[PDB]
Design a protein around this nucleic acid. Structure first.
Lengths: 185, 141, 84, 99, 60
RNA sequence: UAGCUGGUUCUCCCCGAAAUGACUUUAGGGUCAGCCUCAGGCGCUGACUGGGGCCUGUAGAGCACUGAUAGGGCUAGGGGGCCCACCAGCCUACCAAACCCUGUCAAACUCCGAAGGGUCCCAGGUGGAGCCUGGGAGUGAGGGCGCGAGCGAUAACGUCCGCGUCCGAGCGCGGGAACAACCGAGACCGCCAGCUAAGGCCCCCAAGUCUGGGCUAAGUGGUAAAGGAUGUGGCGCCGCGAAGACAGCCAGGAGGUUGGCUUAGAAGCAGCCAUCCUUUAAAGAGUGCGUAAUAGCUCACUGGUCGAGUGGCGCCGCGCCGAAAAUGA
RNA sequence: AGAGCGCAAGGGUAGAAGGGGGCCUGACUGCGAGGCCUGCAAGCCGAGCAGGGGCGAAAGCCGGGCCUAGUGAACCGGUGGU
RNA sequence: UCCCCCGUGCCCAUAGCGGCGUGGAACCACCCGUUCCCAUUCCGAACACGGAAGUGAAACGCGCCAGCGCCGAUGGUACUGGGCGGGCGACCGCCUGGGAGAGUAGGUCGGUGCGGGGG
């Protein structure tokens, strides 16, 4: 979806920030210059899409170049946004994370023990034509001390995988009742 | 309450603490997170007291993860014994905490629950804190 | 004031530390016999017209110029160009 | 694997690299400096006799003369897996004082 | 290659060794001194060095 | 005798030290080396800097080794068993070799590793620079200030080093009210001459009660914290409203039910789990209060009046509380 | 290259220092340029040259030891000897 | 002056690892023999030596692929020469010049120099 865009130059980093606009960068196989945009609207847009869905930045050069984000480098101290990277899209093989949707409340759950998941996004290679909005995956009946991983998840056809996939996707573990104070003994 | 298990040298130098935090500044784990603002030590005593404080507030809770680890000696000497002579004794095990550092995460609760949990627990911490959700940082191994 | 016990020690010791390192860098002229490297190991293996001895030392073999060298799968080296 | 830089133990100054196959000798004189080689002779690659040993003798001997024929005194002797059986050229005739 | 002249502004009295040695390099002995010295990036280096205790100008 | 104490007389002109390095029956003492000095020898070489070339392992950062580590996976396996042996087979919210994923810790860990720094050549550089012999020294209790590490308690006008600077020897001058080392500042003499540094410009006191915009209401200013708050003023966001919100003001404020369990009784209502659906504009298996449980007050919620703005979530500038001590403020 | 590398540690190490055998005794004498280090005195580096040898056909290295601890000025006197 | 194999040198892993295919008409390698030189702390495995009808299996030589392993921009933060602040303090900010680490895109199954034997 749409955000503005602004061609960056040889202007000092700090100032662009403490004026009104966060700075950025874009690169695709050969195309590399420097860019930047507003803060507040950018933050709004980001909070939705970010490295989940697709961005479309219409730039003061005449066009409407659509990218994805990629990497959110911050200041860490009083941590908060400060220069991101953008990825100029196409139709070529590309790995990226897909936010997953654990749907349905299992048996390990409701018995007490709660899901201690591993991921909320999986690395997967796809053609940029496939948009796997979010794999609204099962988690029908996970048990306490029970796990699930691998290719267990449904994958939207074409949208391949990119781990092992023995990467354990999630699992349910015990609570932490006041009987853990008896442990203090 | 955490420490290593007898390792290398016993006594080591406390040193001054800057503020790059080196790393550890997002959620990734739980869902709600307590992160700090004052460059100090986290005390194993406190550490346990806060972990409890949370657990205590919400009987039969979820899973409370502890990112930081208290693994530094308290070089403390006896009392009224005059100076020089020896270093001290390793005592009170603590850790370096530089602001903008995740220390504990609550997962699987009410909004209110993790709010007041992190609230009270960190309220018991040797300093003061900020309590954040889980979003703007996504993508970091 | 109460001066009872006080835990003593058995630590404080070091070394009349001799001064070790690259004595003569590059661009430097030697009359042969001038040692260019006092090292403990072989951080600097012999170069052209440079010799080594019992204490791992790159010294001069002629009257020329120290030239530095690196060889990833062979180590680092210090040599002496002729100057005829 | 007789690498060992037997080369280095002969990398005093000026080599002479030789090696054998199943049937053919490859006697060559290599000078370093830049890497430039120099002088050749081969038991069964000079179109010569088909008896490894004696040919080699003569071939080295051939090369031997060749050495002095183009201004050679003393050099090294690049040989890997030898078990030192001379190859009674040993370039001992070999001008060079091979042996 | 235009000439560079400087004016000594802030007292040498209380500054690191390199600073003092630089001033003592520039034919600069006490305050308020128009020093007209031809350009040479050695001298310039010695300016960006002393740059604050002094004031500059590339007078032609 | 006294490596100790004490005293040590005339004037101007020049430079100008050190409170360290080792060594000792030395620590409050002497040789020596560094630092001051004067004569004679040397002549761009020296401090400093530009260029090139090199050495380096810290600040960070990384986890690839060294160990420390939190959470899950996977499992060698260890408690194990189901239950046959010339030996097998299948098996857990126990714990656990390793590996893997998930974060991370380090002065004596290091794949990476800068700003710097040291140093060898090209050149500028004339300065109480530097170099060489030579006589006389005095020094060898130091202190302060800044970042840099140790000690200490990330206490001490504490201590012990590093680079740096001042006091020391500049208790000579202006600031800082006063004030060895904090700011300005290197004081041959004379001048009833002007500029300016810091710091100031109502007055003590010399100079702007100068111009313009923005804040605060406490003597804040005129000296403290976490932590608490309908203090004040701008910024940003997020639902509600003329189809009528916000507050108050009328009224509705229901049924299976006394929810299943606990429980002496637990009936929204001391706790455990709850996680209905139905008549309805709307009444929830409940917001607090009330009971022996009950009753009951009230709310929540929708419509009646009313008729314009409202409820709240963060940030930021200054304050408010937090905040008790010894002669007169 | 994480093992061994005599014994603490660190650097170093198979393109060997480690590990096997043969041979031997340079764990030489007379020196020693030019250096490291440096208050002095000490300590530490080494080609080279002569002798006369050990190893290898040689090329070649050998004036102990992978490297840094294993040490004691002088005065006194014993010692074999010119 | 060229296309191929071999004896061998240089950069330092964009050369290494691994699946695929491969060439011997010369080179190369296995391979034929263990009686003459030689030797296994035992074996002719290794080095050694005299030698064919085969082979190209391996060893090796060459091509494709990135899958492991390797290098890795750009930006911006870190840290910091040197210059000024602010807070009792633990610490924090402005100036200039320098300028990483981790990661992101992409890239990589080599580069080259010699001397002979072949067409």
């Amino acid at each position: 979806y749409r955000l503005k865009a602004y061609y960056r130059e040889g202007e000092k980093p700090s100032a662009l920030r403490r004026a009104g606009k966060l700075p950025g960068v874009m690169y695709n196989r050969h195309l590399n210059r420097k860019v930047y945009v507003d803060l507040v609207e950018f933050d709004k847009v980001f909070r939705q899409a970010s490295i989940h869905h697709v961005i479309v930045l219409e730039l003061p050069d005449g066009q409407s170049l659509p990218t994805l984000v990629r990497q959110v480098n911050l200041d860490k101290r009083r941590r908060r946004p400060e220069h991101v990277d953008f990825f100029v899209l196409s139709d070529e093989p590309v790995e990226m994370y897909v936010p997953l949707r654990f749907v349905g409340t299992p048996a390990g759950v409701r018995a007490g023990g709660v899901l201690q998941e591993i991921h909320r996004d999986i690395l997967v290679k796809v053609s940029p034509r496939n948009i796997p909005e979010f794999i609204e995956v099962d988690v029908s009946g996970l048990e306490i001390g029970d796990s699930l991983h691998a290719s267990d998840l449904k994958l939207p056809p074409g949208v391949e995988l990119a781990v092992s996939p023995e990467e354990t996707i999630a699992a349910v573990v015990p609570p932490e009742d006041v009987e853990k104070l008896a442990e203090e003994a | 309450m955490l420490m290593p298990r007898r390792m290398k040298y016993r006594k080591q130098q406390r040193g001054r603490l800057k503020g790059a935090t080196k790393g550890g500044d997002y959620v990734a784990f739980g869902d709600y997170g307590l992160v700090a603002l004052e460059p100090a030590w986290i005390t194993a005593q406190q550490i346990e007291a806060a972990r409890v404080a949370m657990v205590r507030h919400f009987r039969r809770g979820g899973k409370i993860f502890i990112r930081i680890f208290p693994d530094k000696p308290y070089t403390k000497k006896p009392l009224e014994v005059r100076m020089g002579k020896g270093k001290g004794n390793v005592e009170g095990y603590v850790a370096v905490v530089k602001p903008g550092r995740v220390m504990f995460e609550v997962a699987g609760v009410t909004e209110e629950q993790a709010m007041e949990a992190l609230r009270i627990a960190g309220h018991k911490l040797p300093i003061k804190t900020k309590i954040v959700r889980r979003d703007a940082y996504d993508e970091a191994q | 004031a109460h001066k009872k016990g006080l835990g003593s020690t058995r630590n404080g010791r070091d070394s009349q530390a001799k001064r070790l390192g690259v004595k003569r860098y590059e661009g430097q002229v030697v009359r042969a016999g001038n040692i260019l490297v006092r090292q403990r190991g072989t951080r600097f293996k012999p170069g052209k017209n440079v010799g080594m001895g019992r204490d791992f030392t790159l010294f001069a073999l002629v009257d020329g110029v120290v030239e530095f060298q690196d060889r990833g799968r062979l180590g680092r080296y210090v040599h002496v160009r002729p100057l005829a | 694997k007789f690498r060992v830089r037997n080369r280095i133990k002969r990398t005093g100054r000026l080599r002479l690299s030789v090696f054998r196959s199943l049937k053919h000798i490859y006697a060559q004189i290599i000078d370093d400096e830049k890497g430039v080689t120099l002088v050749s002779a081969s038991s069964l690659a000079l179109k010569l006799k088909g008896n490894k040993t004696e040919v080699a003798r003569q071939v080295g001997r051939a090369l031997a003369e060749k050495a002095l024929a183009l201004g050679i005194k003393q050099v090294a002797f690049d040989r890997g897996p030898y078990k030192y059986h001379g190859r009674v050229k040993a370039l001992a005739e070999g001008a060079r004082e091979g042996g | 290659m235009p000439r560079l002249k400087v004016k000594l502004v802030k007292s040498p009295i209380g500054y690191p060794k390199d600073q003092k040695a630089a001033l003592k390099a520039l034919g600069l002995r006490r305050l308020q001194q128009e020093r007209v010295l031809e350009d040479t990036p050695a001298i310039r280096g010695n300016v960006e060095k002393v740059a604050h205790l002094v004031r500059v100008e590339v007078v032609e």
